[PDB]
Coordinates of N, CA, C and O and ligand atoms in Angstrom, one line a residue:
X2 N -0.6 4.5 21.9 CA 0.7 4.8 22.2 C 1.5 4.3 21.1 O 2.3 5.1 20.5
X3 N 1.4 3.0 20.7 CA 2.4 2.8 19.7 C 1.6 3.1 18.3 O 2.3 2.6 17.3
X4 N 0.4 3.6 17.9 CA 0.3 4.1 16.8 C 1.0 5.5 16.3 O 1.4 6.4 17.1
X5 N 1.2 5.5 14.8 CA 1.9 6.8 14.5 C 1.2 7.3 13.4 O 1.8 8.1 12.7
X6 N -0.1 6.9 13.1 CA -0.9 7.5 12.2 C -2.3 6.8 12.8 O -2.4 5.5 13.0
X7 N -3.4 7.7 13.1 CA -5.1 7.0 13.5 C -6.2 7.2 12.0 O -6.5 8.3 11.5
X8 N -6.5 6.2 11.7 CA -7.6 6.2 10.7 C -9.0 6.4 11.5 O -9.3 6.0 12.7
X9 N -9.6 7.1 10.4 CA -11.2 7.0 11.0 C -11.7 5.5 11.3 O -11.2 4.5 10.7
X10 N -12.3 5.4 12.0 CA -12.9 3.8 12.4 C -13.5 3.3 10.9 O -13.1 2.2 10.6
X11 N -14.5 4.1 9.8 CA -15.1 4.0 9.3 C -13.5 3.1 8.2 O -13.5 1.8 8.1
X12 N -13.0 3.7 7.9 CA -11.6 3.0 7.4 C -11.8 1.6 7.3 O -11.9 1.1 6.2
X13 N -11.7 0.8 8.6 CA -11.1 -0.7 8.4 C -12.4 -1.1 8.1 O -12.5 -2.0 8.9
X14 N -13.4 -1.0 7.3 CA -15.2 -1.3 6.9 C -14.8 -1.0 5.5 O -15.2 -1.9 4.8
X15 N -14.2 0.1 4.8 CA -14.4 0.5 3.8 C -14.5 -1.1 2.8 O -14.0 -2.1 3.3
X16 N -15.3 -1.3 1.5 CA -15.2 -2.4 0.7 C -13.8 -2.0 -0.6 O -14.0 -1.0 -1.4
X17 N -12.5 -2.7 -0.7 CA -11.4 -2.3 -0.8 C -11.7 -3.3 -2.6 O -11.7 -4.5 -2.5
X18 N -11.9 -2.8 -3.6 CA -12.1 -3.8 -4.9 C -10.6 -4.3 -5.2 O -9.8 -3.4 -4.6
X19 N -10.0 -5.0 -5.6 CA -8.9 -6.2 -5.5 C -8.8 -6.8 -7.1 O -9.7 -7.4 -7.6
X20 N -7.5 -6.6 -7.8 CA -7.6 -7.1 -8.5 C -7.9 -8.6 -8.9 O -7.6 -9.5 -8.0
X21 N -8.3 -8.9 -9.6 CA -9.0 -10.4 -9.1 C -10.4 -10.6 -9.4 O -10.9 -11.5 -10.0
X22 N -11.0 -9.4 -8.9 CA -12.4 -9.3 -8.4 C -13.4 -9.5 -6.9 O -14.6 -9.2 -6.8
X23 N -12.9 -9.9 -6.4 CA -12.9 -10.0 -5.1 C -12.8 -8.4 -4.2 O -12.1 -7.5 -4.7
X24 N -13.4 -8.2 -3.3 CA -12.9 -7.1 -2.3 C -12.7 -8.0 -1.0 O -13.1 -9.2 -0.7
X25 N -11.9 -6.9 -0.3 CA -11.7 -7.3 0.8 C -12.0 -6.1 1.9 O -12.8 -5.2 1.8
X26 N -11.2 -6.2 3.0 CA -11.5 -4.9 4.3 C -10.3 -4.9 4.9 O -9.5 -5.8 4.8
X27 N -10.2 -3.9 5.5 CA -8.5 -3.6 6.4 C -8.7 -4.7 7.9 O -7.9 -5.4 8.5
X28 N -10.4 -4.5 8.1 CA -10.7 -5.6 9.8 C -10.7 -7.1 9.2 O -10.6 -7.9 10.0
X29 N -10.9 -7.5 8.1 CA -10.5 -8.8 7.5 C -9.4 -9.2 7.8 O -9.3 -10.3 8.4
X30 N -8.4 -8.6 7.6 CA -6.8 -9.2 8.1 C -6.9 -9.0 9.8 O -5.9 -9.2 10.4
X31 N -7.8 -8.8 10.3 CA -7.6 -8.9 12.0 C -6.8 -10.6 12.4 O -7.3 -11.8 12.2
X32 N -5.5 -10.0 12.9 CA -4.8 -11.4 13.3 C -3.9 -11.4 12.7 O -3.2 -12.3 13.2
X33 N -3.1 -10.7 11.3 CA -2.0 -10.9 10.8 C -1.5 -9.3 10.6 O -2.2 -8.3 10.4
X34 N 0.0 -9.3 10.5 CA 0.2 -8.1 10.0 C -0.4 -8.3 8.6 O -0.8 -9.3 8.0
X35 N -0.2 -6.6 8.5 CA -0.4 -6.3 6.5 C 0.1 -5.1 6.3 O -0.2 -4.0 6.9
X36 N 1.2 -5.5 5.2 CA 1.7 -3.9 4.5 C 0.9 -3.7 3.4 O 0.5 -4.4 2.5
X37 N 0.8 -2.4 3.7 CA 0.4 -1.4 2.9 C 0.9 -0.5 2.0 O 1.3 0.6 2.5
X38 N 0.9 -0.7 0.2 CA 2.0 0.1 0.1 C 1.4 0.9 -1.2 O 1.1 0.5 -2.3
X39 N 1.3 2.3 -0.7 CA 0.6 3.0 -2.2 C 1.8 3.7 -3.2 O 2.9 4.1 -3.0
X40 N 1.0 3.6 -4.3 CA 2.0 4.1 -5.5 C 0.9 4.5 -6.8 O -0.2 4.0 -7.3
X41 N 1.7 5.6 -7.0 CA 0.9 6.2 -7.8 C 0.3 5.9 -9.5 O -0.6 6.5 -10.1
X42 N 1.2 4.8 -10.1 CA 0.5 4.1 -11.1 C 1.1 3.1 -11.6 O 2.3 2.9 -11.6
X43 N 0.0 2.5 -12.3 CA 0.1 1.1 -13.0 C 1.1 1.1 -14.0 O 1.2 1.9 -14.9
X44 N 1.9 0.1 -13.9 CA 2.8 -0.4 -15.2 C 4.0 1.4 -15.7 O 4.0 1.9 -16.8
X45 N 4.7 1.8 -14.7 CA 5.5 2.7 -15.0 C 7.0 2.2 -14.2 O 7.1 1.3 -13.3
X46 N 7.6 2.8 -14.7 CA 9.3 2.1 -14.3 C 9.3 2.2 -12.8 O 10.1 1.3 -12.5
X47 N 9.0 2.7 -12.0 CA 9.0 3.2 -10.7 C 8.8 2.3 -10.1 O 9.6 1.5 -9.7
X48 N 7.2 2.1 -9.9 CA 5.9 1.3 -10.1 C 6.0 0.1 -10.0 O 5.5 -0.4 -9.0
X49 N 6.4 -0.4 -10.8 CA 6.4 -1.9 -11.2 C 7.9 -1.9 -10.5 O 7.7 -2.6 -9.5
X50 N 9.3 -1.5 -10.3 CA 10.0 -1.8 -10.0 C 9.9 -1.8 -8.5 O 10.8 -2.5 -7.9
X51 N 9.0 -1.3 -7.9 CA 8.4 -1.8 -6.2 C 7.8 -2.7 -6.4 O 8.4 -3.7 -5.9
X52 N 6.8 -3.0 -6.9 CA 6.0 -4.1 -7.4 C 6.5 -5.4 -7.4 O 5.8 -6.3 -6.9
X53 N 7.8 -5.6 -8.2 CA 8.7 -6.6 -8.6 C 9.5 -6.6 -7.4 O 9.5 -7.7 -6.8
X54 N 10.1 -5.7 -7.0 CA 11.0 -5.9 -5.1 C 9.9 -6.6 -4.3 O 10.1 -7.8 -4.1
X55 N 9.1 -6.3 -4.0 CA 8.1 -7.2 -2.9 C 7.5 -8.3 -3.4 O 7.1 -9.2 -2.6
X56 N 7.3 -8.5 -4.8 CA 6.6 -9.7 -4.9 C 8.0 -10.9 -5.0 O 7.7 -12.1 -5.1
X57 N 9.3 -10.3 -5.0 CA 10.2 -11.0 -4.6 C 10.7 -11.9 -3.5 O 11.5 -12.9 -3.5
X58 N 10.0 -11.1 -2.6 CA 10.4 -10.9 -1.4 C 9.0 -11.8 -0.4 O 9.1 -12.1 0.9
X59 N 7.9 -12.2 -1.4 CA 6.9 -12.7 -0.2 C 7.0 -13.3 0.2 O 6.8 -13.0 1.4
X60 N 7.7 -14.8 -0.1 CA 8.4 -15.7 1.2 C 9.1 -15.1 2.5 O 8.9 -15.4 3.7
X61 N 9.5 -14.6 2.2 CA 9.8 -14.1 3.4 C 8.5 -13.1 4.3 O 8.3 -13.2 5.5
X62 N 7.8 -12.4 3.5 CA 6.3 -11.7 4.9 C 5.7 -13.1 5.1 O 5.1 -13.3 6.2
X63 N 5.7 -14.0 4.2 CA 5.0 -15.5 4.6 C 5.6 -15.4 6.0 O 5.0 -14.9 6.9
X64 N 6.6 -15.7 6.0 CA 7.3 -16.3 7.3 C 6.9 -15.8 8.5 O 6.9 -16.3 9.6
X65 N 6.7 -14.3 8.0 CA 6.3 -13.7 9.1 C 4.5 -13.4 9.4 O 4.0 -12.6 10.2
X66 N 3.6 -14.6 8.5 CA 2.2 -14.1 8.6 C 1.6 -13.1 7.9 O 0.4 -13.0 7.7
X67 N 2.6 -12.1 7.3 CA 2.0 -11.3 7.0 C 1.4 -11.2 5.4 O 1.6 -11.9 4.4
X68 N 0.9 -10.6 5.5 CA 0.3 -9.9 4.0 C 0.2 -8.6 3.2 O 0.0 -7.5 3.7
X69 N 0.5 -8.8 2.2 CA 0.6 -7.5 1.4 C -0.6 -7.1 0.6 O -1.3 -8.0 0.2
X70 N -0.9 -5.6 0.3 CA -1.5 -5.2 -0.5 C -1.3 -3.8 -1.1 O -1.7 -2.8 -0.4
X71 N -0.8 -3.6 -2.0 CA -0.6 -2.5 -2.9 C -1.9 -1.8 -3.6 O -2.8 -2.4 -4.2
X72 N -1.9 -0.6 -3.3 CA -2.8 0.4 -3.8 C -2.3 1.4 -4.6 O -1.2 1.9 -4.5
X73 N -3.1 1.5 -5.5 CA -3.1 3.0 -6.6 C -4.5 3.1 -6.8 O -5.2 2.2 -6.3
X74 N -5.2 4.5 -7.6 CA -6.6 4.3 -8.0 C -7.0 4.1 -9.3 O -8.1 4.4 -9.7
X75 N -5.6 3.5 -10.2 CA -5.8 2.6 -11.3 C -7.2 1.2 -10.7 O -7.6 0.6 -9.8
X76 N -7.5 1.5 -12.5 CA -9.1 0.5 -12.0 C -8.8 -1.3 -12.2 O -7.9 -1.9 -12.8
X77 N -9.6 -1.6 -11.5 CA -9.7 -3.2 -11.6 C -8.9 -4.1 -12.6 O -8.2 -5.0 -12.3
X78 N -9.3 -3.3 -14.0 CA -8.6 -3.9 -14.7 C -7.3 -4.0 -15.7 O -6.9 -4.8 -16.6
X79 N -6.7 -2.5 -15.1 CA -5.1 -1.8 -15.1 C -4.6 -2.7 -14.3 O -3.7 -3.5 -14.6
X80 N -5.3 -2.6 -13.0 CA -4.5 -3.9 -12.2 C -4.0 -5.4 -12.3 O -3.0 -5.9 -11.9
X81 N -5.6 -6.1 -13.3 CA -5.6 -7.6 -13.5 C -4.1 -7.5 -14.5 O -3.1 -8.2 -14.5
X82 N -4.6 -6.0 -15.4 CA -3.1 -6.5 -16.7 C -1.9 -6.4 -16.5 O -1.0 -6.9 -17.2
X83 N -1.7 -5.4 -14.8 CA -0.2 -5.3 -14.4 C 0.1 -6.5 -13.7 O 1.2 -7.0 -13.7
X84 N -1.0 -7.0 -12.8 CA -0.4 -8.5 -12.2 C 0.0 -9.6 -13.1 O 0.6 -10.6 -12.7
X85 N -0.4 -9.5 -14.2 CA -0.3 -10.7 -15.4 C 0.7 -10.4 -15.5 O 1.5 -11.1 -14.9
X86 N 1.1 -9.3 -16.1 CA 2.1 -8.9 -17.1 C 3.8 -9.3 -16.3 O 4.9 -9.7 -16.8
X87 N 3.4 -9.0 -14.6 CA 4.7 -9.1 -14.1 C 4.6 -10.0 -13.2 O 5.6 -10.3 -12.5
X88 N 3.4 -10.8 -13.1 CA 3.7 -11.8 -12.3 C 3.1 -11.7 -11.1 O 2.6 -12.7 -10.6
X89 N 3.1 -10.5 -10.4 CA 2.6 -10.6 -9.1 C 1.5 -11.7 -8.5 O 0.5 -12.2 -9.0
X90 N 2.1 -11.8 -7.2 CA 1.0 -13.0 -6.3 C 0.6 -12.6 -5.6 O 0.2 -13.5 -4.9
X91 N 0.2 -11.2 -4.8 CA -0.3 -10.6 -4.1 C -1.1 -9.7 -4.7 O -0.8 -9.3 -5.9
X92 N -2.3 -9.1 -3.9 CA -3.7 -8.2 -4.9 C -2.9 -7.1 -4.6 O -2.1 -6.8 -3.7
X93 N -3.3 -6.6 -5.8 CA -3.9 -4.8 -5.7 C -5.1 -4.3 -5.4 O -6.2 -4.7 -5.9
X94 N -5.0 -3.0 -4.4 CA -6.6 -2.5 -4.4 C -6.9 -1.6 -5.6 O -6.2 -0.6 -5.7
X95 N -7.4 -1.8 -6.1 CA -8.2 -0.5 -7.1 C -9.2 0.7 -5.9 O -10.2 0.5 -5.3
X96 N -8.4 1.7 -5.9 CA -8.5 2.5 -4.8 C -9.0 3.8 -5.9 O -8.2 4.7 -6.2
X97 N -10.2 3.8 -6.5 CA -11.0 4.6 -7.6 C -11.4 6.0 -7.1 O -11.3 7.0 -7.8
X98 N -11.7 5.9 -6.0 CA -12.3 7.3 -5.0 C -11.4 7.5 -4.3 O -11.4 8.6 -3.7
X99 N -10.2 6.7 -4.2 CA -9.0 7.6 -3.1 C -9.8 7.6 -1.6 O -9.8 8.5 -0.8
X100 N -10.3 6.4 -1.5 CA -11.0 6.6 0.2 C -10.0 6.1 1.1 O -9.6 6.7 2.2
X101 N -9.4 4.9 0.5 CA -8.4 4.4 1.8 C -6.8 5.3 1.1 O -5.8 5.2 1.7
X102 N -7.0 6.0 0.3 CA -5.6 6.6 -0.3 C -5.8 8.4 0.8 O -4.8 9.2 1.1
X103 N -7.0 8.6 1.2 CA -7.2 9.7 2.2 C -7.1 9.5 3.7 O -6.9 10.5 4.5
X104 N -7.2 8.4 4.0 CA -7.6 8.0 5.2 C -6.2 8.1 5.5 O -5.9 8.8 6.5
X105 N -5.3 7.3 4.7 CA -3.8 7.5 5.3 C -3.2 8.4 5.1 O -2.1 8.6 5.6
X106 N -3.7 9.3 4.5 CA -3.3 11.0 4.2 C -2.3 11.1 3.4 O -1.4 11.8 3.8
X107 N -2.2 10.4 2.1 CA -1.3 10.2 1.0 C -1.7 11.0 -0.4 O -1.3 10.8 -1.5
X108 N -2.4 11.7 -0.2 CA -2.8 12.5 -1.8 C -2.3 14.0 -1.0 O -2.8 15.0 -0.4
X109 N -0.9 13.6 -1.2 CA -0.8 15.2 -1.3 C -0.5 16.7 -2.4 O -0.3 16.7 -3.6
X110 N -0.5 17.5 -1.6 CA -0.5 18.8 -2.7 C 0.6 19.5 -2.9 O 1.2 20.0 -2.0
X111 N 1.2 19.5 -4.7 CA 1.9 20.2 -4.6 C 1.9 21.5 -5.6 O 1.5 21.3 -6.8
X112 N 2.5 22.8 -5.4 CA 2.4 23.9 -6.4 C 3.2 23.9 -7.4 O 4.4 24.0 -7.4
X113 N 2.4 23.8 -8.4 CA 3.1 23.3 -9.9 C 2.6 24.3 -10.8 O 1.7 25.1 -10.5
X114 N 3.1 24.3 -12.0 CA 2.2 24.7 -13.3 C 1.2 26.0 -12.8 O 0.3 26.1 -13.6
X115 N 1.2 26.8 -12.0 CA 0.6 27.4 -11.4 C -0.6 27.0 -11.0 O -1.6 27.7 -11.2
X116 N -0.6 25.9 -10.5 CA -2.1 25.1 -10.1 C -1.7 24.3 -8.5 O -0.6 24.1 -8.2
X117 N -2.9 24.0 -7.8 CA -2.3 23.4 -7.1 C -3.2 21.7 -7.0 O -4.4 21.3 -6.8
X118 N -1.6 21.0 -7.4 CA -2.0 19.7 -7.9 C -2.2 18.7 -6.9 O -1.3 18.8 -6.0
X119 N -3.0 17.9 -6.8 CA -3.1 16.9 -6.1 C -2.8 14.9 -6.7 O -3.3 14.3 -7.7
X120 N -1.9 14.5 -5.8 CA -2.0 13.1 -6.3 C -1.2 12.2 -5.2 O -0.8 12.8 -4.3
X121 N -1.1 11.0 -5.4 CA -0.4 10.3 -4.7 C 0.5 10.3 -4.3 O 1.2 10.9 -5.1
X122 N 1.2 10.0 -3.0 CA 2.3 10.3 -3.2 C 3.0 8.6 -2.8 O 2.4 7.8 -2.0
X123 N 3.9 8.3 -3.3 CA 4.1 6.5 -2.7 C 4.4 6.8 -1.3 O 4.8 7.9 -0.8
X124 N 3.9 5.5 -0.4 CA 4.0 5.9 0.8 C 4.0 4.5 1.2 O 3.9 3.7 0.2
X125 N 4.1 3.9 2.3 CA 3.8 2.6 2.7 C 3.9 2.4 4.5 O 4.7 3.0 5.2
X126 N 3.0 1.6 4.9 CA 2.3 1.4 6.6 C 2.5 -0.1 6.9 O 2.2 -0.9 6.1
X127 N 2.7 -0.3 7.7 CA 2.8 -1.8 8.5 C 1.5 -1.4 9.6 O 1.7 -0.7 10.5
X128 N 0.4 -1.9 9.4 CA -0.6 -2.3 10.1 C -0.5 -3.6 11.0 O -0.1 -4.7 10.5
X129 N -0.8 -3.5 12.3 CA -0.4 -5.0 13.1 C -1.7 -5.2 13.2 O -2.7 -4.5 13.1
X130 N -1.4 -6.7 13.6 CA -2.8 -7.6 14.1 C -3.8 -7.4 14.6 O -4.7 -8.2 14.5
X131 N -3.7 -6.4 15.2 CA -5.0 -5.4 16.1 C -5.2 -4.0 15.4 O -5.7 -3.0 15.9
X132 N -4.8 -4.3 14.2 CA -5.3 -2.7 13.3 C -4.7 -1.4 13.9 O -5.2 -0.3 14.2
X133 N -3.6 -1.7 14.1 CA -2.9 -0.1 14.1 C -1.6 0.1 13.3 O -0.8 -0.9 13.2
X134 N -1.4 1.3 12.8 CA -0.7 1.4 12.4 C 0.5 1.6 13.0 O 0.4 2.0 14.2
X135 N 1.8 1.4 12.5 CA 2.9 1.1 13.9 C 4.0 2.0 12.8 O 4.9 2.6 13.4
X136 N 4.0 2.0 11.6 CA 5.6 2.5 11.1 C 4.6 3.3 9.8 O 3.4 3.3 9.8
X137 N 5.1 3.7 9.3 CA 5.3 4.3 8.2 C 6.1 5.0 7.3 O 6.4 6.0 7.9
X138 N 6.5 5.1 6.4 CA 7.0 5.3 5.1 C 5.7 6.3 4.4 O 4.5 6.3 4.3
X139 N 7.2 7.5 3.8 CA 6.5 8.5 3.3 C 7.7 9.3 1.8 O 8.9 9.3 1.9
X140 N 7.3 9.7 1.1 CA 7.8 10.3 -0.2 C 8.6 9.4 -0.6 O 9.7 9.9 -0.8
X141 N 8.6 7.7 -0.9 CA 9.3 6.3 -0.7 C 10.1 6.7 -1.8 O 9.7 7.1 -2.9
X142 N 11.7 6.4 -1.5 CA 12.6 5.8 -2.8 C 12.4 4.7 -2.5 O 12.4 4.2 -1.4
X143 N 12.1 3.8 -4.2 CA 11.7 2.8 -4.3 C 13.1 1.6 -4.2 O 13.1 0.4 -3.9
X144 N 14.1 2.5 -4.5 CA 15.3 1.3 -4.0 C 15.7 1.3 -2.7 O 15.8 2.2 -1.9
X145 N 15.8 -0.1 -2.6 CA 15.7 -0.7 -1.0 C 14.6 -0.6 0.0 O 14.6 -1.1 1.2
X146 N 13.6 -0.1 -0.6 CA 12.1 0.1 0.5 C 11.4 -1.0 0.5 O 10.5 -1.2 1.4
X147 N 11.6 -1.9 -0.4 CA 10.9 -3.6 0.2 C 11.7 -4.2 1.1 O 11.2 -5.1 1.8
X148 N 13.2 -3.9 1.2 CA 13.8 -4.7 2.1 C 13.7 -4.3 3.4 O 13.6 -4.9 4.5
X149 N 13.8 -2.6 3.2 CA 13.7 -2.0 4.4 C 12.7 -2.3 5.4 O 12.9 -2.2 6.6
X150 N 11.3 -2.7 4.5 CA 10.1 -2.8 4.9 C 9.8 -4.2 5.4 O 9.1 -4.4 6.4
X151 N 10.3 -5.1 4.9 CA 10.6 -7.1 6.0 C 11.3 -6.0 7.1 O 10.7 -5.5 8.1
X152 N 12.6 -5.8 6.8 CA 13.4 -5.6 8.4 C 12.7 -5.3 9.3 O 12.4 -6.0 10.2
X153 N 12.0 -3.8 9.0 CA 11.0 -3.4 9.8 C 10.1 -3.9 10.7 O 10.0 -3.8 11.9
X154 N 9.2 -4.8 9.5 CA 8.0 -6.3 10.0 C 8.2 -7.0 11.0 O 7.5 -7.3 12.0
X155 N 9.8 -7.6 10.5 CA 10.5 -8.8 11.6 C 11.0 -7.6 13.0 O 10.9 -7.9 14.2
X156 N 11.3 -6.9 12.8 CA 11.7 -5.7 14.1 C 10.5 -5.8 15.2 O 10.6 -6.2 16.4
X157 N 9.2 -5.3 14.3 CA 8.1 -5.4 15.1 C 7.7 -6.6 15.3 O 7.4 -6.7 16.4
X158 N 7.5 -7.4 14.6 CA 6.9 -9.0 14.9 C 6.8 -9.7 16.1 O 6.0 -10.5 16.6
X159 N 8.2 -9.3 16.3 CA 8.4 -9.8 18.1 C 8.1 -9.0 19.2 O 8.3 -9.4 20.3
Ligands
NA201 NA1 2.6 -3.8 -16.8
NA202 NA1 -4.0 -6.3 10.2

């Protein structure tokens, strides 16, 4: 009832590579929220200026338990050099095959160049404690969508 998007089960299993080196799983965070927030690449003005709004802002998902993780299917080590570069304290997944970038139904298609193109589109999910998805965010303007996205958290939290 209160989900607004269903992932395949296979989903919260998938092994998620992290910059870092480490992987993690979506059923690993069982017990805390986690945002979820895709974007379509490493180290571009867009990009990094979400990047930089939420890693601003972690104290505050602390407060609330939660956790973040950002996805693109920039590789492991686009990621290590964008987290250096700006600081971030929260992982990135290196999302290589677009498995968890499909599951949430974020590669979409559009008619361009006379081709039809596929790619990311930024998007972002509040997953609760029991693995459902409860909100989501879709074709994200990146100004104000970290703040919008605490409000939201603290909305649902209680
Ligand atoms: Na960078
Ligand atoms: Na969760």
């Amino acid at each position: 009832t209160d989900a607004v998007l269903e992932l395949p089960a296979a989903t919260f299993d998938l092994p998620l590579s992290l910059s870092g080196g480490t992987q993690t799983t979506l059923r690993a965070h069982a017990g805390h929220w986690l945002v979820i927030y895709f974007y379509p690449k490493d180290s571009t003005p867009g990009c990094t200026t979400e990047g930089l709004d939420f890693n601003a802002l972690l104290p505050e998902f602390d407060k609330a338990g939660a956790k973040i993780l950002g996805v693109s299917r920039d590789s492991v080590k686009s990621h290590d050099n964008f987290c250096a570069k700006q600081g971030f304290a929260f992982p990135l997944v290196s999302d290589g095959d677009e498995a968890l970038c499909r599951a949430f139904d974020v590669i979409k298609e559009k008619n361009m160049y006379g081709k039809q193109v596929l790619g990311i589109e930024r998007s972002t999910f509040l997953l609760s404690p029991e693995g459902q998805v409860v909100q989501a965010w879709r074709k994200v303007k990146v100004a104000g969508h970290a703040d919008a996205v605490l409000a939201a958290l603290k909305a649902h939290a209680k």
